[PDB]
């Protein structure tokens, strides 16, 4: 009995919106199957023979029934389903690893940028060029309005 | 390159304090006033400075301008400093807001990391369902086989016992309806039992 | 003792059934047939005197990976 305990809201967080129905069906399946497994014990109570040895006056019917039962090996079904989901898991892990590395790169870059902004020049000592380089939103569009004051008059 | 705080310490808006301290060790508090009055009396007397309507004018203008500064000076001063401090506060708020924006971006990316880390519950749920379904099918098979074998066994023992019942009841009814057809000896026994009344 | 002579003689006559498969029953078959009929077609319909055979079904399954 190899089961993996699970959160469920953590499951709910990681369902891309294209397949919420499939996943919800899977959750329902999980719970109904758990109940079904609880709905019956592990192994059947094997029939004793004495109660039928001393009661079934039929010749060799009880005997050969018991024996062919002993001579019966119920086919334990093999999955062939798990290995492929394992491979799918593998690929997903790879994609998540590359995505997360890219995100860590973006993260350290944001960090460097924030640190630049953190090491600012005291504003009173700051030439307009340093304000410009600190915020491109403080840069006159000398291209689109080439004459003074290079911006909408009313905007002043 | 910052601005030095203050100006030059001019006096009357016409003479800087450098001149007064310049003369201080030589004639001190009586130097400049005397030099000024002497020079002005000179320029008056020797027809150096002509007195005409221009005096009327320039005195009116000096008067207007002295009243002007002395009245509306503080207002323009504090308006200037208003403009400066306001621009400064606005720049500080732009800075803080940008810092906070990028910090939010960082924390959101970290959240992305946490979730895509959490991802694997999907695959372990799939695994769980697989194994559970398999063992369910197996146990169902075992109970199927035990059920069918028990069913055949019961069936046989049941028909056996039912035949036992039917034959037994038929036998007892046979013997009752058969003994009937079969001596005053019983009558003598009746008189004996009655004699046993007491 | 009437019923005691009855008991002994009738018991010795009843144990005398080695020759009688239903000991001079001569009837009650008309209902015995349908009785065991009911009992059978209530327990089942197949040959309930031979060993049980077994088919085994297998589960349904799906595409599970991201589509």
From Swiss-Prot, chain A:
**Protein's name in the database:** ATP synthase peripheral stalk subunit d, mitochondrial
What are the subcellular locations of this protein?
A: Mitochondrion; Mitochondrion inner membrane
> Transmembrane stretches, by residue range?
none
Which Gene Ontology BP annotations are present? proton motive force-driven ATP synthesis; proton motive force-driven mitochondrial ATP synthesis
The family database entries (InterPro entries) matched by this protein are listed as: ATP_synth_F0_dsu_mt, ATP_synth_F0_dsu_sf_mt
Q: Name one GO cellular component term.
A: proton-transporting ATP synthase complex
Gene of this entry: ATP5PD
Q: List the disulfide bonds.
A: none
| GO MF terms, alphabetically ordered | proton transmembrane transporter activity
Q: Which organism is it from?
A: Homo sapiens (Human)
User: Where in the sequence is N6-acetyllysine found?
Assistant: 27, 58, 67, 73, 80, 90, 112, 139, 144
* Subunit relationships: Component of the ATP synthase complex composed at least of ATP5F1A/subunit alpha, ATP5F1B/subunit beta, ATP5MC1/subunit c (homooctomer), MT-ATP6/subunit a, MT-ATP8/subunit 8, ATP5ME/subunit e, ATP5MF/subunit f, ATP5MG/subunit g, ATP5MK/subunit k, ATP5MJ/subunit j, ATP5F1C/subunit gamma, ATP5F1D/subunit delta, ATP5F1E/subunit epsilon, ATP5PF/subunit F6, ATP5PB/subunit b, ATP5PD/subunit d, ATP5PO/subunit OSCP.
Q: Which Pfam families match?
A: Mt_ATP-synt_D
> At which residues is N6-succinyllysine found?
73, 80, 90, 139, 144
Q: Where is it mainly found?
A: mitochondrion
From Swiss-Prot, chain B:
The protein's name: ATP synthase peripheral stalk subunit b, mitochondrial
One GO molecular-function annotation for this sequence?
A: proton transmembrane transporter activity
Q: What does this protein do?
A: Subunit b, of the mitochondrial membrane ATP synthase complex (F(1)F(0) ATP synthase or Complex V) that produces ATP from ADP in the presence of a proton gradient across the membrane which is generated by electron transport complexes of the respiratory chain. ATP synthase complex consist of a soluble F(1) head domain - the catalytic core - and a membrane F(1) domain - the membrane proton channel. These two domains are linked by a central stalk rotating inside the F(1) region and a stationary peripheral stalk.
Tell me a GO biological process for this protein. proton motive force-driven ATP synthesis
Residue ranges spanning the membrane: these are none
| UniProt modified residues of type N6-acetyllysine | 95, 110, 118, 177, 192
Family recorded in the similarity comment = Belongs to the eukaryotic ATPase B chain family.
Lineage of origin? Eukaryota, Metazoa, Chordata, Craniata, Vertebrata
Instruction: Return the GO cellular component terms, semicolon-separated.
Output: membrane; mitochondrial inner membrane; mitochondrial matrix; mitochondrion; nucleus; proton-transporting ATP synthase complex
Recorded name of the encoding gene? ATP5PB
UniProtKB/Swiss-Prot annotation, chain C:
Q: What is the recorded function of this protein according to its Swiss-Prot or TrEMBL entry?
A: Subunit F6, of the mitochondrial membrane ATP synthase complex (F(1)F(0) ATP synthase or Complex V) that produces ATP from ADP in the presence of a proton gradient across the membrane which is generated by electron transport complexes of the respiratory chain. ATP synthase complex consist of a soluble F(1) head domain - the catalytic core - and a membrane F(1) domain - the membrane proton channel. These two domains are linked by a central stalk rotating inside the F(1) region and a stationary peripheral stalk.
Domain of life per record: Eukaryota
Q: Which GO terms describe its cellular component?
A: mitochondrial inner membrane; mitochondrion; proton-transporting ATP synthase complex
Phosphoserine, modified sites? 26
A GO BP term, please? Answer: proton motive force-driven ATP synthesis
What family does this belong to?
Belongs to the eukaryotic ATPase subunit F6 family.
Q: What are the entry keywords?
A: Acetylation, CF(0), Hydrogen ion transport, Ion transport, Membrane, Mitochondrion, Mitochondrion inner membrane, Phosphoprotein, Transit peptide, Transport
Locate the transmembrane regions by residue number: none
Organism whose genome encodes this protein: Homo sapiens (Human)
MF GO annotations: proton transmembrane transporter activity
Coiled-coil stretches, from where to where?
none
What is the protein named?
ATP synthase peripheral stalk subunit F6, mitochondrial
Describe its assembly.
Component of the ATP synthase complex composed at least of ATP5F1A/subunit alpha, ATP5F1B/subunit beta, ATP5MC1/subunit c (homooctomer), MT-ATP6/subunit a, MT-ATP8/subunit 8, ATP5ME/subunit e, ATP5MF/subunit f, ATP5MG/subunit g, ATP5MK/subunit k, ATP5MJ/subunit j, ATP5F1C/subunit gamma, ATP5F1D/subunit delta, ATP5F1E/subunit epsilon, ATP5PF/subunit F6, ATP5PB/subunit b, ATP5PD/subunit d, ATP5PO/subunit OSCP.
Q: Which residues carry this modification: N6-succinyllysine?
A: 55, 60
Q: Which residues carry this modification: N6-acetyllysine?
A: 2, 7, 40, 55, 60, 66
Major location category of this protein:
mitochondrion
The subcellular location is: Mitochondrion; Mitochondrion inner membrane
